[PDB]
Design a protein around this ligand. Structure first.
Ligand SMILES: CC(C)(C)c1cc(O)ccc1O
Ligand SMILES: CC(C)(C)c1cc(O)ccc1O
Ligand SMILES: CC(C)(C)c1cc(O)ccc1O
Lengths: 172, 319, 319, 172, 319, 172
C-alpha cells in the first residue's frame, strides 16, 4: 500500500478486533486492553460503501437487439452481426477487468491511508509526551491510568498535564 | 517500563484474493463477486409479459398455421420460440424471413385486424391436404387461396384498401409457385400468373415460377410470403392475373416498442425476474454476468470473465 | 505565549459538487462542465460547405425533378434534406434507395456530366402531366423518356459508352412499369419490354410489370430507378426491347470524400461552427455532448449524461 | 483525501486567502498576518491545468457515418444499425463517467498531497525549534519577528540561529 | 561534525518521456513501448496454414477456372488473394458475391466432393473459347455446360440429390444469359429458359435475360453463379427448361471454423508468426499495434497512436 | 509525485547508484560510502513487474472478421461496416491512451512512495538519536563507525546503545 502502514510498519492485524477495523491496544499500570476506533473505521467503511453504491447505478436495459446465434451460414450480414457482438463483448470484458483492478488498487490504498491517519492523529495528541516505537506503538513517558488511556482514545487527552513528567523521563 | 499504546487494524483467519493493477493474487479481509454466474433454469413470467409459441414459431403464428390458433390476439414483451416448433401447413418460404420475424417480434402483437375483401371472379377459401386442421383440408387462417371460378376465368383481380386509420398496417400475402403447367392452368386458367402489390411509395411484382420442388406434406409447389406496409393516408392495391395468395386483413404496427422474440428451451416458471436469457432468468444486483450474450430486460452486462472480485476490505495480515 | 505559524488552504462560500469513485456529492472549490448541452438553433454555413435541398431531397435533385433546378452543379460537405421536401414528378421508386442516397451524399456533387446519346428507332424526350415545370408537361431533367417512333417499332436499343476518363462514373436510369396492356403497346409496341444494363463485371436485367398502382399526380404506372457504376476502362451497354428510361449522362464519383447528408429542420444561419447536428450547431471545447447522436464534423462525443463535472480545485471547507 | 490534511488535520480553509491556494497565517510579537505560498499553489495549479489540457487533445472528427433515425420499420438491417449505435453510446457514456470519477478522486488527492508537502516543508525548516500543534500550526519556541516569519515563508530561515533559545524553551 | 546518513534513489544521464494524467512529457528512468510498429514484410507460413491463390481469387478457385487447378483439395486457415488474380474463363457475375467469398473462405477448403449426375436429354460438357486450358476450349472444371441434344430438344431437366451425409453441402451452379435469340434457340431450343433450384426449405428461380453485354474474352453473354446449401436429411432439385449451368458435385461446409481470406501483396516467407496483416506478419508481445486494422490470428489490438510509452521506473532527476 | 520525496525533498538522484533503485550514502569518522537498499528496490521492482505481466494476459485472437477495405462504392452496408470498424478503433485507441496515462501516474506515485517508506523506516530506527535534515539525510548525534552504519542499513541498529550520548549531544 502507498502508505506502508498496513502490511508495513504495522507488522500484522489483530484477529481479536471483532468490533472495528482499526483500534488501540494499550499497556499500563492497571493492565492491558483493546478498543475499536470508530472514526477511522467509519471513514473506511463509508468510502467502501460509497464505491459500492456507485457500482449499482443500474443503466443496462435492452429489449429488441440483434440475433446472436445462427442456424445456417449466410456470409456478409452474419459476419457483421457476429463481429459487432464480439467487438462489444471484448470492450465490456476489458472495462470490467480494468474497473476492478483499479478499484482494488485504490481501496487497498484507502484502507492503508486510514490506518496512517489514525497513527498520525494519536502522534499529534501526544506531542512531546510519547515517542514512536516503529511498530505502530507509542511509548508514553508518564503514568497513564485507564482514564488517561481513554482520554487518548476519545481525543480529550491534554498533553500539557503530563508534559513536565514526560519530558523529564524522555531525558533520563 | 512506561505505558505503551498501539494502533492496529483487524485480521481474519481466511482472506479472499483480489486482483489489482500490479498483482494477480492479493489477499484482503472481504470482497464481493461482480460477475453473476447463476440463472434460474426457468423463464420468469413477470414482470415481463411472455407468450409461449410452443409448437408455432412467430411467423407460422402470424400466418395462422394449424398448430397456431391459441396465439390469436396474443400480445407480448417477449415472444418465446421453441426449438420443437414445426411447420404444419402448405410448404412456404419468406424472402428476407428474418426481417419479417424482426418486424413481428417488435410490434408485440398477433391481434389481426380482419377485413372484408371482394375478390371478383375467383373461387375463394382454397384448402389443402398439406395443411390439415382437425384432420380436414385447411389453410393459413390469415390467408385466402383464390383459384379460377366454377365457369372459367380468373377475373382480373384489382382490389384496394385505403389506410383510414392512424396506425401503420402490415399486410401479409403470398404467391403460389405451382409444380406443373397442368396445375397452373387447372388453378388459374392463365399460363403464367402475376401478382403486383403496391402503395403510393413502394411496390413489389412477382411472376410465379413453375417446377418440381422436393415434396413436403406431399406437396411439390410452394407459396412465397411477402409483406407490405401502409402508412396512414396511403393505399394498397392487390393486382393479380393469377396465383395471388390473398390477405384476410392486416396487423397493426406499434413501432419502436419494447418487444422481442427469444429462442429458448426453458419452461416458463412462476418466479419473478426482470432479466431473461435463452438459458434461464437472472436474479442479481451484480454489474456483470457470463450466463449468456442473449440477455433481455434489465440485466448485468455480458462479460467473458467467470469472476471479478471487488475488494471491500483492507489487506488481510494474520500472523 | 510563543509565536505560531499555521499552514492552510483557501475556501469559498459556495462550492460545486463533483462525483468521485466513492462519493456522489463532494464539494470542491471549482469545477468544469464536460458535457455540452447547448446548440445554436441555426446551422452554421462555415467552415463546412452546406447546400440546402429546400424542397428537393437528394435523389429528386439527382434525377432533375421540377423543384430541383437550383441544385444543378452544386457541391457540398453536407447536403441538407428538409422534412418539407416533396415529389413533383412522375411517381417512382428506387430499389435500395438508401444506398443511392448514401452514394450521392458521399460523392458531394450534383454536377452532371452531360452526354450525347443516339437512341435509334424511338421517339425521345417524353413528357408527363405528372411532372409539370412552369405549368407544362415535363420530366426528370437528367432522364430521357423514349417511346416508339412515329411510323412504328421501338427499334431495338443497344448503345454503349466507354469510360475514357480517370474517374468512376455513376449512371442513373429507369424502367417504366405501365398500368395496362393498352399503354404498354401504345408506348413500346412490344407486349412485354426488357431493359438490360451491363458492364464487363456487373449487370442488371429488368422485365417491366404491368398493373394498376394507386394514382399519384394522376398516374398509376411507375418508374423504377436503377444505377450502374463504370470504372476507368470499362464500358456500359444499354440494351432495351422496350420501357427504358434512358440516361442523359452521368455523375462523377469522388469516393471516400468527407461528404454527407443531414436531415434537419433548422434554418441556415450566418454563425461559424465545425460541428452540425440535426438540432443546430455546437460551439464548444467540451469533450462530450448530449445534444444529438447525429453529429457531423469536429464534435464532442455524444453521451447520455446531461452533466459531468470535472473538479478543478481542492475540497471546499468553509467554516 | 489520502493525506488527511485538507478536510483532515486542517480543520477548515481560509475564505480570506484570495491570492493563493495555500498559505501561512502567523502570530508574533508584532501581530498577525496571512500570506500565500506560491510554490505549493503553483504545483497544484500546474497539475490541474496539465490534466485539463490533456482532456482537450481533440480527435473526434466524423463526416459520412450511418443513419441514426428511421421513418419506417425494416427489420434486420435497421436492428443492426440501431444496435451498433446504441452499443457505441453506452460505451462512451461509460468512459466519460469513469474518467470524471477517477480524475476527481485523483485531483482531490493531489490537492490534499500538496497541502501536506507544504506542512512537511515547514516542519523540516524548523527542526527542533518548533512543535507540531496538531492543527496545521507550529508553535515556535523563540521570538520570531516579521523578518523571521518571512524567512520561514521564503525558505531562508536558518534553524541554528534560534536553536539554543528554542531547545531551552522546549525544555522548561 | 556528527555522522550523517542520507537516503536517495538512482538517476541515469538520459531519461525517457512518458505521459501521465496531468503531464505530456515526464522523464522517467526507464519505459517500455506498448504499440508495435514493425512487421516482417513477408507472410509467415506458420503456425497458420496458408494457401496462396496466386493468380486465382477464391471464387475462380471454387468454380475451377483455368489458372486454378493447383488449388484443388486445398485447405487453409488463411487463403491469400492476390491483387494480380485474373479471370481466365467465361465472363460471370455472382449475385451477393461477397457472401459466397465469405462462406468459402470460412469453410477453409477447396476439396470438391464429386458427384455422378444423369442429365437427361441434353448434350453435356460444353466448352468455350473464352475459357482456354492448354490452348483448347474448356470450362469451369466444377461446372457442366449443358445444351440441346444432337436430334433436338432440351429434354426437361429434373434431377435430385438427397443429403445422405452428416455435413451441410454447398452446391455451385449457374444460369446462362445469352447475347441473342439466335443463340438462345441454337443452344436450348426453347425461346425462353428457366432454372429452378430448391430444397425443402429454400428456393431460387431465374429466368435468363438476353441481350448484348460488353465483350470479354470475345464473349457478350454471361453466366450468373448461384449457390444452394443442403442440410443433412434435405434434398435439392435442379429443374430446368433451359440455360442451366449444372454442378458436378458439392463442397463441404465446416461452419464456424477459424478460416478466412486475406487480400495481400506480400510474398510468403519462411518466418514464424501467429499474426498476419495485409502488410506482413507481426512478431511482438506488445499489447497494441498500428501496422493495420486487417489483423488475423493472435495479434496486438489495432490502435491509432504510433507510440504509447509505459513508465517502468521512477522520475529521472540527474543533477 | 504524491509523496514529494522523489523530485521533492530529495533534491536529486544518484547516477552512481548502479546496483539498486534506492540506497544509503553516509559520512562518519572512517569516511564515506554508498550502498543499495534491497527491500525498497525489490518492493518497487516487484510492483512494476507485477503491472507488466498483468498487461500481457493475452486475449486477442481473431480469424474471420469483416472486410475492412473496399474496391467500389456500395452505400448502406459498406457505411455500416466502416462505421463499425471506426467505432471499434476509436474506443481501443481511447482505452490504450487512458491505460498508459493512469498506469504512469500510478507507477510514479508508487516509486515516490517506496522512497518515502525507506526514509520513514530509518527515521524509526534512529528514534531520538538523529534529526531529519530536510534533504533525505539524518544527522546522527553519536559516533557511528562502519559497523554501526551497517547496523542501520540492515535493521539491527539498537537505538538504546547510543541514546544517552545522542540525547546529550542533541541538547548542547
Ligand atoms: C487491468 C488490465 C489493464 C491489466 C487488464 C488486463 C487484462 O488481461 C485484460 C483487461 C485489462 O483491463
Ligand atoms: C464510475 C463508475 C465506474 C462507478 C460508473 C458508474 C456508473 O453508474 C456508470 C458508469 C461508470 O463508469
Ligand atoms: C488520457 C486521457 C483521458 C486524457 C486521454 C486523452 C486523449 O487525447 C485521448 C484519450 C484519452 O484517454
Amino acid at each position: 500500500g502507498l502508505f506502508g502502514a498496513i502490511a508495513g510498519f504495522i507488522e500484522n492485524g489483530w484477529q481479536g478486533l471483532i468490533d472495528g477495523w482499526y483500534g488501540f491496544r494499550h499497556q499500563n499500570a492497571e493492565g492491558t486492553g483493546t478498543a475499536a476506533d470508530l472514526k477511522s473505521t467509519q471513514a473506511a467503511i463509508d468510502q467502501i460503501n460509497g464505491k459500492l453504491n456507485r457500482l449499482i447505478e443500474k443503466t443496462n436495459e435492452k429489449y429488441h437487439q440483434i440475433e446472436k446465434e445462427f442456424e445456417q451460414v449466410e456470409g456478409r450480414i452474419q459476419d457483421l452481426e457476429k463481429y459487432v457482438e464480439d467487438t462489444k463483448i471484448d470492450l465490456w470484458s476489458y472495462n470490467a477487468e480494468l474497473l476492478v483492478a483499479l478499484e482494488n488498487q485504490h481501496t487497498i490504498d484507502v484502507t492503508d491511508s486510514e490506518m496512517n491517519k489514525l497513527f498520525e492523529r494519536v502522534r499529534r495528541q501526544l506531542r512531546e509526551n510519547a515517542e514512536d516505537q516503529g511498530n505502530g506503538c507509542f511509548e508514553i513517558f508518564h503514568q497513564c491510568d485507564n482514564n488517561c488511556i481513554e482520554s487518548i482514545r476519545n481525543g480529550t487527552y491534554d498533553h500539557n498535564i503530563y508534559r513536565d513528567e514526560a519530558i523529564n523521563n524522555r531525558i533520563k | 517500563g512506561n505505558p505503551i499504546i498501539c494502533l492496529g487494524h483487524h485480521a481474519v483467519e481466511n482472506g479472499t484474493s483480489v486482483k489489482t493493477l500490479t498483482d494477480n493474487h492479493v489477499e484482503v479481509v472481504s470482497a464481493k463477486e461482480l460477475v453473476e454466474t447463476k440463472h434460474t433454469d426457468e423463464l420468469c413470467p413477470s414482470p415481463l409479459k411472455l407468450v409461449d409459441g410452443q409448437d408455432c414459431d412467430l411467423i407460422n403464428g402470424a400466418l395462422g398455421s394449424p398448430g397456431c390458433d391459441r396465439l390469436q390476439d396474443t400480445t407480448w414483451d417477449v415472444f418465446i420460440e421453441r426449438p420443437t416448433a414445426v411447420d404444419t401447413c402448405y410448404p412456404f418460404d419468406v424472402p428476407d424471413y428474418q426481417s419479417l420475424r424482426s418486424i413481428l417480434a417488435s410490434s408485440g402483437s398477433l391481434e389481426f385486424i380482419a377485413e372484408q375483401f371482394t375478390w371478383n371472379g375467383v373461387k375463394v377459401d382454397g384448402s389443402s391436404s398439406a395443411c390439415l386442421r382437425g384432420g380436414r383440408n385447411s389453410f393459413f387462417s390469415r390467408l385466402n387461396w383464390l383459384t379460377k371460378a366454377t365457369n372459367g376465368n380468373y377475373g382480373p383481380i384489382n382490389v384496394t384498401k385505403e389506410n383510414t386509420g392512424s396506425y401503420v398496417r402490415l399486410y401479409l400475402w403470398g404467391v403460389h409457385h405451382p409444380s406443373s403447367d397442368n396445375e397452373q392452368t387447372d388453378l388459374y386458367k392463365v399460363a403464367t400468373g402475376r401478382v403486383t402489390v403496391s402503395t403510393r411509395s413502394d411496390q413489389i411484382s412477382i411472376v410465379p415460377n413453375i417446377g418440381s420442388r422436393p415434396r413436403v406434406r406431399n406437396q411439390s409447389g410452394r407459396i412465397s410470403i411477402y409483406w407490405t406496409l401502409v402508412n396512414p393516408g396511403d393505399s394498397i392495391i392487390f393486382n393479380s392475373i393469377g396465383n395471388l395468395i390473398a390477405p384476410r386483413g392486416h396487423y397493426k404496427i406499434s413501432k419502436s416498442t419494447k418487444s422481442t422474440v427469444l429462442k429458448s428451451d426453458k419452461r416458463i416458471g412462476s418466479c419473478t425476474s426482470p432479466c431473461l436469457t435463452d438459458k434461464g432468468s437472472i436474479q442479481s444486483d451484480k454489474p456483470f454476468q457470463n450466463v449468456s450474450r442473449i440477455a433481455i430486460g434489465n440485466c448485468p452486462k455480458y462479460v467473458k470473465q467467470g469472476s471479478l472480485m471487488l475488494a471491500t476490505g483492507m489487506r488481510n495480515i494474520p500472523g
